[PDB]
């Protein structure tokens, strides 16, 4: 559109005076734009030696025989010639007129274009497929990135549920044992002070033995009565065996195995 | 093997469509080093 008509570096409108030349890549730029062996395209490559550059013939709205123009098509040389060239150079070279050779060429280029156009219709469709596929690949990367993380947390959520419950189990056992122990230190010290008191008073009374028998022998009944209180005090300490060292379930080798796969 | 030649030369003309400045001799060595996969040639092309 706005560029097909325009030239190369200067992007002039096609001036036929400009002697514009059309490269094999079909790009067009006047010989003023590019002077310098093998000539290279401003966009593509040096696809062909300068010997394969035509001059663009676009002048909107013969090589040899001067003002005699070309109108006629030499069928034996793929290109056009004037009436003279087919008398000297192409004598009885089987030859054809412009009107028929152009009809066929137009109908073969329309075929090449109609098929090639049907082909670039699929790139216009497969470009969108690749464009949407990339977003999928990166979405299917950041969703697998989250499925693993949320699955790991669901495991750890339930494990801490059955990790704290076992801790609450040990919690229960110890206040139950402590309540038992606290009645066994309470029991000891109070019985001990009862034992201490009888031992205290009976010792002092017995230890004073210098003409003190008259005071002692009047209280023998209550001495030996309260000795029966301490003859049978009736507690014996039990021992709660420690088994919490063996209520830790250390199956460590199993933990790595199931962590290895996932 | 004349079929095999055109299937090789087909892939060559496309590198010139993409990266053209490098020579026709250089691209031919890479389209054998790749075994004429349509994509993996354009892979090694960018690498050099
Ligand atoms: Zn120009
Ligand atoms: Zn070009
Ligand atoms: Zn001829
Ligand atoms: Zn002539």
Author numbering:
A (entry chain A): 59 to 94, 113 to 137, 209 to 409
B (entry chain D): 151 to 198
Tell me, in the authors' exact words, what the paper reports.
To improve the diffraction resolution, a KAP1 RBCC construct lacking residues 141–202 (KAP1 RBCC ΔBBX1) was produced. Crystals of the KAP1 RBCC ΔBBX1-SMARCAD1 CUE1,2 complex were tetragonal, and diffracted to 3.7 Å resolution. The structure was solved by molecular replacement using the cubic crystal structure as a search model. Similar to other TRIM family members (Goldstone et al., 2014, Sanchez et al., 2014, Weinert et al., 2015), the biological unit is a single, elongated dimer, which is symmetrical in the tetragonal crystal form (KAP1 RBCC ΔBBX1-SMARCAD1 CUE1,2 complex) but slightly asymmetric in the cubic crystal form (KAP1 RBCC-SMARCAD1 CUE 1,2 complex), suggesting that the coiled-coil domains may have a somewhat dynamic structure. In both cases, the dimer interface is extensive (∼5100 Å2) and formed primarily by the antiparallel association of the coiled-coil domains, with some contributions from the RING and second B-box domains. In both structures, electron density was only observed for a single CUE domain, which we conclude must be SMARCAD1 CUE1 based on our biochemical data. The majority of contacts (i.e., ∼520 Å2 of a total interface area of ∼600 Å2) are between CUE1 and an exposed surface at the C-terminal end of the long arm of the coiled-coil domain of one KAP1 subunit, but the interface also involves the RING domain of the other KAP1 subunit of the homodimer. The α1 helix of SMARCAD1 CUE1 overlies and buries the exposed KAP1 RBCC hydrophobic cluster that is comprised of residues I338, L376, M378, I379, and V380. Thus, CUE1 α1 helix residues such as Q163, T164, E167, and L168 contact the exposed KAP1 RBCC hydrophobic residues, with T164 appearing to be particularly critical. The CUE1 α3 helix—despite containing the conserved di-leucine repeats, L195 and L196—contributes only minimally to the interaction interface via contacts with the peripheral charged/amphipathic KAP1 residues (e.g., R330, W333, and T334).
